[PDB]
């Protein structure tokens, strides 16, 4: 509840920064500045996505909202097993030695790819799970799940944008601090979730 | 604000609590006394911000 | 007790800001920051919530109020067991080599989905003890526990917004110190209720 | 004596903090909230509760006044042993394989009941000894036992609200500074009342 | 989206500078200032670059544009190997003692060249992984993927280029912190993308 949509959130912006000078375009410039931000720090559950995607060339095409990797597994079709990462020498020496394994096991990134070692027909499924970026707030996009989960992000976000085009600076200090705590609040509450789950995917393969 | 009475020789001072930027006083007197007026004193709190 | 409903609430703010040029709405907009400041913060025996849920495409889905995980129990009719968490690797290699235990023991968290390993057919009851979210503070929902339980929290949380409205500094910080000393020891209250259980829950798991 | 009843509290009060423009209602509600601060502190001999609880659907139901919870004993007839905590996962192990010991001997915590493991039949009583909150000081109820056992962490209470109310804040860091050294003297004597006493209720279950 | 092309930079770089006293070739020079400095500090997914490049005269040609080597790969043709690094004593021992490997295995960094131990005649293919500049932004070049992908990095830029231009100081240092906040925020996310490869790329030859 709170703040519904973009237009009550910028009445509020002018409300409490009591300025009459700012127009749409200059609120909808600061709204995308604070997403922009946003989209650099939040792993949140709302966040993340899991899909099918086609091998292509012995290659899976990175999704262009990509923002992290969670895991990719193989269909149970071409063996159905969750991938690993190795690094080139590894992809190199495998391939030279023709390593030959049941399914495919192995992935490593070149460029804007994910190539698989056990070189797989064009058309072979795969299900990733990543984390993407933030939906656009704007005219015609007027909701999105971060505004109705915590407007105060976007409220003191926008507010420190005002005050900085303002040419004022402490209370940009000031509210960019109520901004980092309410993001930290929120990461914070993510992680602990689950309580289970925090003690895992921490520890991986250490030899 | 509303009217706060002041017994003339008794009452050191009236309190009150008015948060604004301009201010203005009101003294009324009734009759049936005598009395001579020179002066007041304002006591205030710290700033409330500016808005 | 004390404060009543939010009517109250309003009045009172007013009497102690001596702000009478407040509407309605700036009220609203600042209970419903206070609310959502609590939701990221308490963790009580009134937030916890236990019910039956069902399971449908292998899948449990998680509710729309969820905000933490305490336990997941399988029925009686499906094995009756604790279920406990694994990883997705971990699931990966059971479903591969076809663990086939008694009945439901393990599971995952998938996109917005609990995943169980030993999949069940669709119409499974789980039961799930969980923490959701503080009832929503308005016109149409006058009263609440956390209103009644301990009104300094609301009070306080409101005088905060109230001087972050109108531009102040130290009284603002002063209020917001005041709204988290409140909030503390409600937490520790709540903390310290059984002694013999502060014990537990904490050391599970080693190995 | 001193102080026998809240309008004699509340006239010293008015007396001390020298101003005129306090109403009943404005006194009532820093009472109130003094008290309501007082109940997430005090764990004290006066405050302690212990009465026989009846089971119904194989728990018992948490009293609307409960804060803190000692001990809970089963009745003779059923058995007549302290209880002791057992996490969820002991519980459910314990069902699965019929453990069946004599008398109701664990309990554990669900929601807003504690169940009791070997399964009673509802009429069983127990009797629990706990914690309540500081009985409600106002017009219908003049006296407390709180009121008459120092009034001065009263006064002291009323005093840091008034001034809280008036928007000066150092005197009311002042006089909640006098408060909390009255709360922890008070305390600190109930904790001292028996020395032998104190080396216990510390050290259990380490193993 | 936020902003699009390099005028709706300087016009939103005008806008909250207010110095409208500016000219384009000074806006231009800011600009390019800008992705001069950040041409020195990233090394992000779409910087990469990889590509066959021919061997002449016993070596292989850096590319103009190159700023950072990832990794080189002979064709398997000539051996699909990957190569590794070694000294100029270490080649000279080798073509001195006549090793004769069985492909092309070394390489080494002769002025502006790379030159592989088993020498091979002209035309040899190979397969080059490196980073290269970020293309520069201009009336000529109107977009560029760091303009989509992080608006705030150019327009904290050129305010903190303004401010240097117009000798003020305490601006000018704390628009440079917020462009290298910012510059750090986008490597940290570009870092964290898969977790995996962290570790490894790190340890190559340690005997």
């Given at each position: 509840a709170t703040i519904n949509n973009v237009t009550d959130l910028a009445i509020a912006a002018i409300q409490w920064s009591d300025?009459?000078?700012?127009?749409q375009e200059l609120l909808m410039l600061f709204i995308g500045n604070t997403t922009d931000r946003l989209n650099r720090l939040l792993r949140v559950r709302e966040n993340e996505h899991f899909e099918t995607l086609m091998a292509f060339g012995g290659g899976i095409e990175i999704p262009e909202h990509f923002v992290a990797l969670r895991s990719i597994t193989g269909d149970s079709l071409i063996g159905g097993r969750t991938l690993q990462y190795i690094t080139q020498d590894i992809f190199t020496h495998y391939v030279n030695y023709n390593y030959?394994?049941?399914?495919v096991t192995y992935y490593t990134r070149l460029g804007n790819f994910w190539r698989v070692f056990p070189v797989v027909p064009d058309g072979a499924p795969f299900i990733v799970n990543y984390w993407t970026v933030l939906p656009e707030l704007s005219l015609a996009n007027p909701t999105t799940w971060a505004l109705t989960k915590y407007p105060q992000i976007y409220l003191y976000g926008v507010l420190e944008q005002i005050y900085l085009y303002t040419m004022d600076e402490a209370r940009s200090q000031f509210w960019g601090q109520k901004l980092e705590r309410a993001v930290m609040e929120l990461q914070n509450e993510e992680n602990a979730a689950d309580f289970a789950s925090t003690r895992l995917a921490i520890k991986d393969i250490e030899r | 604000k509303g009217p706060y009475p002041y017994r003339i020789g008794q009452d050191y001072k009236i309190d009150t609590k008015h948060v604004g930027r301009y201010i203005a006083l009101k003294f009324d007197f009734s009759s049936e006394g005598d009395w001579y007026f020179n002066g007041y004193t304002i006591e205030m709190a710290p700033k409330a911000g500016m808005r």
């Amino acid at each position: 509840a709170t703040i519904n949509n973009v237009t009550d959130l910028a009445i509020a912006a002018i409300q409490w920064s009591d300025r009459q000078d700012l127009t749409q375009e200059l609120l909808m410039l600061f709204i995308g500045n604070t997403t922009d931000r946003l989209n650099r720090l939040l792993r949140v559950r709302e966040n993340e996505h899991f899909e099918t995607l086609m091998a292509f060339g012995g290659g899976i095409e990175i999704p262009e909202h990509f923002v992290a990797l969670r895991s990719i597994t193989g269909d149970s079709l071409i063996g159905g097993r969750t991938l690993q990462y190795i690094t080139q020498d590894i992809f190199t020496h495998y391939v030279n030695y023709n390593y030959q394994p049941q399914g495919v096991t192995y992935y490593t990134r070149l460029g804007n790819f994910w190539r698989v070692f056990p070189v797989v027909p064009d058309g072979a499924p795969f299900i990733v799970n990543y984390w993407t970026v933030l939906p656009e707030l704007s005219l015609a996009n007027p909701t999105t799940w971060a505004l109705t989960k915590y407007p105060q992000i976007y409220l003191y976000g926008v507010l420190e944008q005002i005050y900085l085009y303002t040419m004022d600076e402490a209370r940009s200090q000031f509210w960019g601090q109520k901004l980092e705590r309410a993001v930290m609040e929120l990461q914070n509450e993510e992680n602990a979730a689950d309580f289970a789950s925090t003690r895992l995917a921490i520890k991986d393969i250490e030899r | 604000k509303g009217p706060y009475p002041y017994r003339i020789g008794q009452d050191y001072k009236i309190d009150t609590k008015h948060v604004g930027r301009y201010i203005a006083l009101k003294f009324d007197f009734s009759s049936e006394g005598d009395w001579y007026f020179n002066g007041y004193t304002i006591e205030m709190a710290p700033k409330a911000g500016m808005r």
